[PDB]
Design a protein that fits this description.
Elements: E1 4-8, E2 19-22, E3 28-34, H1 41-44, E4 49-52, H2 56-66, E5 82-83, E6 92-98, E7 108-111, E8 122-127
Parallel strand pairs: 1-3, 2-8
Antiparallel strand pairs: 3-6, 4-5, 4-7, 7-8
The structure holds copper (II) ion.
């Protein structure tokens, strides 16, 4: 949509897109994560996290390492640019971020930090 994307995380851990293109015109960008299916947060929770492609592994490891209670995102982790909370089936959440935080020509990956989910739930964000 205009400066927004509606992305989904389903019970067979996949995202409904794998490519997000944020236009330079947008001053803010909004992602609305929604979760269809019936499998609950502790078994198939999802979240939308944004970092540079280089930082990704690290955010994922230190988030995995931090636990359900901390929604698998290490607290005040400087590498995560924007993130939603972890949601189970039937939940929704959105995050708007400053597009001026995205550097032109850098590689940004979006992903889900919940254990084992990044292997299929992750894609690219490109700021044109
Ligand atoms: Cu996930």
């Amino acid at each position: 949509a205009e400066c927004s994307v509606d992305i989904q995380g389903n019970d067979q851990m996949q995202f409904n897109t794998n490519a997000i293109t944020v236009d330079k015109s947008c001053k803010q960008f909004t992602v609305n994560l929604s979760h269809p299916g019936n499998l609950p947060k502790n078994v198939m929770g999802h979240n939308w996290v944004l970092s540079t492609a280089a930082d990704m592994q690290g955010v994922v490891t230190d988030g995995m390492a931090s636990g359900l209670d901390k929604d698998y995102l290490k607290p005040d982790d400087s590498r995560v640019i924007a993130h939603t909370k972890l949601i189970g089936s039937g939940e929704k959440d959105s995050v708007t971020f400053d597009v001026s935080k995205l550097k032109e020509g850098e590689q940004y990956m979006f992903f889900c930090t919940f254990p084992g989910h990044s292997a299929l739930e992750k894609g690219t964000l490109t700021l044109k």
